[PDB]
Symmetry: C3
Subunit: 334 residues, 3 copies
C-alpha cells in the first residue's frame, strides 16, 4: 500500500545534468513527488537560424531526467499553463496501465493533473507526450525525456559485482522535420498551430532535416561540452523517443552498456557503438583513461556531422603512453 | 532417420491466431505435415481505398504461423494454383540447405511441391517466397510468415526456469511501396504484372508508402483488436521479412523478450521497446496486470500513426491502484 | 611497458581474405607492426559502369583486416603518398585516446606517421579515416576496415567452452552516395575534389544510390564467390562504418554470433539474421552442413538485390537428406 509510505520531494535540474540521487541505498520505498510544467516555444535549432515550433517538458529538450529506485512510486504533477495553445499529457514507458498514464493526464491549457505509478522495473525508460490524434507531432517537437529507475542495491555487472558512476549525463536525440518553402529555405511559423500540416508532410517522408542532441546543433560543444577527469566513471543516458540511433564515444568505449536500457539484464562490455531503438532510453558506463576532447555521437556519420547528432566531452588528467603513443609524428616519406 | 517417425497433420489457422499446439511436450519427434496454397490478389490496404497487387501464402498477410518442436521435421506441400500468374517457392530461415528450400520448391501456376526439412533449432523464424530475380518484390508484396520451433521442454528464462504463454498472437509487419501517378494519387493496377516496374522504382527509394500490420491500416483494431484478460500471459510473435521495426506495448512491457527470436538464448526482461531486424521474427511474453485498451505498435511513431504500423489489444479485468492511480484528475491550475 | 616487448611484423592481405594468424596462442604480448598506404582512385562500382571517386586504405574497399591478440600493442605506419590529393588519418575504435588515434596520424600527401596503441579489449573493431571537417565523406568514399583483437586463449561460447574457425572472411559493406545530373544519369568526376559538393548533397538525403560488399555490386560472386566445404567452420567478419545492416546467410545460420562484435560477451546462437550497427564490426561463426551456393546478404532485400549488398559462398561436400529432402519435385496439381 503506497498510502503507508513516506513521501519525498525532488527538485529537477535541466539536462545534460541529472538531479542528485543515491545509487545503492539503504532507504525503503517512497512516494517520490515531481512537478513538470509544459512550455511551447519557438527555438533556434541550428547555426543558420532555423527555428522549430517546439513543445517541451520544463522548457528543455529533452525534458529533465527523473530518478527513483525500484519499488518507489513516482508521483508527477503535470502542469499545462494557460499560455500554451495545445492539450498535452504524459506516457511513462516505466509505468503499467492506462497507455503509460496518458489517459489519466490529459491537460488543456490552464489545467493540471497528478499521476502516481509504481516504478516496479529497473532501467532507463522514455516518457513522452501522447495526445490522441497528434502523438508523433508532440514527440518529434520535443516532448520526451527519461525516467531512470535504479535497482535499490545499485548497478551490477553480469557476474553480479557492483558497478557505479561518479557522474551522470542525459542526452536526448531529436529527429526534426522542418518544412521548406518553394525557395528551398526553411519555413518560420508565427504560431505552433501553423507549423502542423507542413510538418506532417515532412514527417511522412521519414527523412529528418536535422538530428540534434539536446535541442540544437552543437548543444553539447564549446562552453557547453560535457566534462570529466581521467579515473572518473560517467553514466551516459541516451534517449530517442521516435527513431533509432547508434551512440559512440570517439577514442573511448562503452565499458558496460545496457543498450535496451533495462538494469535487470546483464550489460555488454567493450562496445565501440551501441544501439538505442526508437522509443527507448539506454545507458552506458565509461571510465576515462586519457585526457582530451572526445566526441560522443550517433555513428551514422552523416546524421552526426551533417545533421547535428554530435557533442563533445572535455576530459582533464594525465596522458598515458602505454595506452597510446605517437611513435613518429607526421613527417616526409623517406 | 525421419522415415522411421510417426507423421502428424496440422490444420493451419489465419493470423493473428496461431494453430493449437503444445509448449512443453512428452511427445518424441514427428514428421509434421502442412499445406499452403498461394493466392495472388488485389487488396485494399488503407482507409482511403488504396490497393496493393498482393501475393500471399494461404490468402493472408502474413502467411499463417507454423508451429513444431525442436527435432521435428517440417513437411510442407506448397501449392501454386493455375489461377495465379507468377511462379513462386519458399525459403525457410528455420531450414538448412538449398537456399532455405527455395531451390527445391519452384512452382509454376498449376504445379505443387513437397519439401521436408529438420527443424533442428529453436526459435521463431521467417519463411518467405524467393523466386530468382524477383525476391524483394514477392516478399514486399506479402509473401512471408513465421515458423515457430518450440523447445521440446518449452520456453525457459535466463536461469533455466519454465516460462509459458496462455495465448499466442502473430503479427506480420509489411513495408509497402505503392506507386503514384503524375496527379500524386496512388496507382490502381489491373494485373499483378503491370504493378511491377513502377513498384521497383518506389522500392529503390527505400521509403515505404505504408507500413501495415497484417495486410492493412487498422487490421488489428476495432472488431479485430487482439484480446486478453488481466493475469493472462500472451506471446506476441512479430515478423518483418524486409525491414527493421521496433515493437512496443503502450502501458505495458516485454516481460521476457527474444528480439532476435532464438529460444536457446536467454531472453531479456522488462523491455520498453525491442528490435526486430529486417529478415527475422522475434517473440515477447507479457502478463497483463491492468485492464483497458493497449496499443501494440512500431515505436517509430511516424511509421505507426502516419504509415499504419499499430494495432490494439483489449484487456478485461480489474484495475490495480497500486500499479497506477490518478491522484488528482485534470482540473484548473490553483 | 611496451618498450620491453618483442616486435613482430605482419604482412597484410587483401579482402575478403584475412592474413594468417593464430587463434588460441601460447605467445606472450608483442608489439605487432603493420603498414598501410592510402590510395585515392576512381573505381567502377556497378554493372552499368558507374564510378566512385574513392578513397582507400591499401587500394581496397574495405581496408585489410588487422589481427592481433588482447594485450598486444598495434603499431601502424600510415603512409599518404604525394600522388594523393587529400589529407588523411586513422581512428581505431579498438584504441583508447586521441579520437582513436586520428589526432596523432594527420598525414598530408607526401607524409607518413607511426601510431602505437594497446589492444586491451577483445573483438572486431572498425577503423576509419576521420579528417577534421570531412569525416563522413572520407568514410563513405571507402576508408574503413576492421581490427580483430582475439582473446589470447581464443574464442569461447556462453559456457566458456572453446570455439574456433577454420577459415575467416572479411566483408565491408559500403553505403554509397553517387550524384546524378539533370539527365538522371550518374555523374563521372575528373578529380576527387570535384565530386565533393554534389556528394554531400546526396549524403544529406540519407538514401544511398548503391550499397555494396567489398567495393562493387557482385564483388563476392562468380569467380570471386567465397568458398568452403561441408564440416568447415567459417568466421564472417562484417564491418559497416556508417550505416546499419542486417547480415543473413540463406540456407544457413549464425551458429555463434557477436553482433556488437566484442568477444568478452557471450555470443548468441542459431540466428537467422543479425544486426551490425553503423560504426561497428561484428562476427559470426557458421559450420557448413550442406553443399551448394549460398547467398550472404543484407536482409533488407531491396538493399541486397536492388542496391548491391549481397555475395555468394560456394560450398563443396555431400548433401544431407536428413537435414533437407525434396519429397515431391514440382509437378502438376492432382
Ligand atoms: Cu504534448
Ligand atoms: Cu511511447
Ligand atoms: Cu512468390
Ligand atoms: Cu530470407
Ligand atoms: Cu581520408
Ligand atoms: Cu568511428
Ligand atoms: Zn568511480
Ligand atoms: Zn499463464
Ligand atoms: Zn573446425
Amino acid at each position: 500500500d503506497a498510502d503507508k509510505l513516506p513521501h519525498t520531494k525532488v527538485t529537477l535540474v535541466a539536462p545534460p545534468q541529472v538531479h542528485p540521487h543515491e545509487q545503492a541505498t539503504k532507504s525503503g520505498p517512497k512516494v517520490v513527488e515531481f512537478t513538470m510544467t509544459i512550455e511551447e516555444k519557438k527555438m533556434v535549432i541550428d547555426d543558420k537560424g532555423t527555428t522549430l515550433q517546439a513543445m517541451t517538458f520544463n522548457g528543455s529538450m529533452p525534458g529533465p531526467t527523473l530518478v527513483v529506485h525500484e519499488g518507489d512510486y513516482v508521483q508527477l504533477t503535470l502542469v499545462n499553463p494557460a499560455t500554451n495553445a495545445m492539450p498535452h499529457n504524459v506516457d511513462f514507458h516505466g509505468a503499467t496501465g492506462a497507455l503509460g498514464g496518458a489517459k489519466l493526464t490529459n491537460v488543456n491549457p490552464g489545467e493540471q493533473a497528478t499521476l502516481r505509478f509504481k516504478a516496479d522495473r529497473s532501467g532507463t525508460f522514455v516518457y513522452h507526450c501522447a495526445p490522441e490524434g497528434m502523438v508523433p507531432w508532440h514527440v518529434v517537437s520535443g516532448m520526451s525525456g527519461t525516467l531512470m529507475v535504479l535497482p535499490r542495491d545499485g548497478l551490477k555487472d553480469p557476474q553480479g559485482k557492483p558497478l557505479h558512476y561518479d557522474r551522470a549525463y542525459t542526452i536526448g536525440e531529436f529527429d526534426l522535420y522542418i518544412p521548406k518553402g518553394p525557395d528551398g529555405k526553411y519555413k518560420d511559423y508565427a504560431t505552433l498551430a501553423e507549423s502542423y500540416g507542413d510538418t506532417v508532410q515532412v514527417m511522412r517522408t521519414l527523412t529528418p532535416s536535422h538530428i540534434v542532441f539536446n535541442g540544437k546543433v552543437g548543444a553539447l560543444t564549446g562552453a557547453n561540452a560535457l566534462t570529466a577527469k581521467v579515473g572518473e566513471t560517467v553514466l551516459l543516458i541516451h534517449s530517442q523517443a521516435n527513431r533509432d540511433t547508434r551512440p559512440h564515444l570517439i577514442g573511448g568505449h562503452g565499458d558496460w552498456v545496457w543498450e535496451t536500457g533495462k538494469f535487470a539484464n546483464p550489460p555488454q562490455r567493450d562496445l565501440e557503438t551501441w544501439f538505442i531503438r526508437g522509443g527507448s532510453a539506454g545507458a552506458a558506463l565509461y571510465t576515462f583513461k586519457q585526457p582530451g576532447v572526445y566526441a560522443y555521437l550517433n555513428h551514422n556519420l552523416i546524421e552526426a556531422f551533417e545533421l547535428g547528432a554530435a557533442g563533445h566531452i572535455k576530459v582533464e588528467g594525465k596522458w598515458n603512453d602505454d595506452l597510446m603513443k605517437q611513435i613518429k609524428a607526421p613527417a616526409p616519406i623517406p
